[PDB]
Ligand binder design. Structure first.
Ligand SMILES: *SCCNC(=O)CCNC(=O)[C@H](O)C(C)(C)COP(=O)(O)OP(=O)(O)OC[C@H]1O[C@@H](n2cnc3c(N)ncnc32)[C@H](O)[C@@H]1OP(=O)(O)O
Length: 267
């Protein structure tokens, strides 16, 4: 016979290292939901007046984000010509202040909430409600589509790289959308909307909860520099990545602490 291998009396020991790293990471950067994201955007507007703090309640989804962007751009086009707006209105903003934001904006920060299971807008909202009630993130995810109007650039940011679909499939969908926007919101010089898929690799490695904060951090990097290469200059170590992100979150949460709730800043 052969000597049986030793089986340790510790069920989970083989995973300790990975479990420990994840626990540390989840603790450093917990989930950012719709409400704190909105506050952060309001705050970002005070720093960068070009950013319109679009409401995240309810957020866009993969089923309606294009229609949502088109409604907004059509309304901005209308405001600039003294025409009436036709799109759905914000709940925390007066109609007049909203028109002022539309006139002034050069950048739409479009957060999209996503879950693999729902197959309609309505079912996505239902899934969102169930998860909120049980206090669970689950397989849900935040994505950011930046509509840079001034540069005519659509920037898609997935901190999980390919959670919704392969990057080339999203590139295709967004490239078709970009040519639609060329007709909807035409440029004088005929410059075409271009598309950027921001992440070449998984950004939030080791976390199931840091997506919201990652979206906001990338947005802030983009606001600092619309050609930011920050994603390429990240620490290789995932814990270190989230340590820096934790510093961002802390700074943001401090900055909005005494800012007014449920109301847009003046344009
Ligand atoms: S910032 C967020 C970034 N997102 C990610 O990183 C995604 C990473 N993937 C995961 O975290 C995994 O999906 C794991 C760890 C397995 C999460 O577990 P689940 O796959 O079970 O998560 P679910 O979304 O499937 O749901 C979990 C709980 O929520 C309930 N639930 C409600 N509603 C739905 C719908 N419409 N589809 C699935 N589940 C759903 C479930 O009953 C479940 O309840 P629990 O009591 O928490 O098990």
């Amino acid at each position: 016979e052969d000597l049986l291998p030793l089986v340790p009396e510790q069920v989970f020991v083989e995973m300790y290292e990975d479990m420990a790293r994840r626990q540390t990471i989840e603790a450093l950067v917990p989930a950012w939901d719709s409400d704190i994201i909105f506050k952060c955007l309001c705050y970002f507007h005070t720093l960068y007046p070009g950013l319109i703090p679009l409401e995240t309640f309810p957020p866009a989804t993969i089923f309606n984000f294009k229609q949502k962007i088109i409604s907004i751009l059509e309304d901005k086009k209308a405001v600039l010509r003294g025409e009436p707006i036709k799109g759905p209105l914000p709940i925390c903003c007066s109609k007049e202040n909203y028109r002022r934001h539309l006139q002034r904006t050069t950048l739409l920060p479009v957060f999209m909430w996503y879950h693999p299971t729902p197959k309609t807008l309505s079912d996505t909202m239902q899934t969102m409600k169930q998860l909120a009630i049980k206090g669970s993130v689950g397989a849900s995810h935040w994505l950011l589509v930046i509509v840079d109007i001034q540069a005519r650039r659509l920037v898609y940011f997935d901190s999980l790289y390919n959670y919704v679909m392969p990057p080339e499939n999203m590139k295709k969908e967004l490239q078709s959308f970009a040519q639609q926007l060329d007709q909807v919101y035409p440029a004088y010089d005929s410059k075409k909307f271009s598309v950027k898929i921001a992440a070449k690799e998984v950004i939030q490695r080791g976390s199931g909860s840091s997506c919201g904060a990652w979206c906001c951090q990338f947005l802030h990097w983009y606001l600092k520099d619309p050609l930011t290469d920050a994603l390429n200059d990240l620490p290789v170590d995932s814990v270190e990545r989230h340590e820096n992100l934790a510093s961002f979150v802390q700074a943001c949460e401090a900055a909005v602490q005494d800012l007014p709730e449920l109301s847009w800043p003046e344009a």
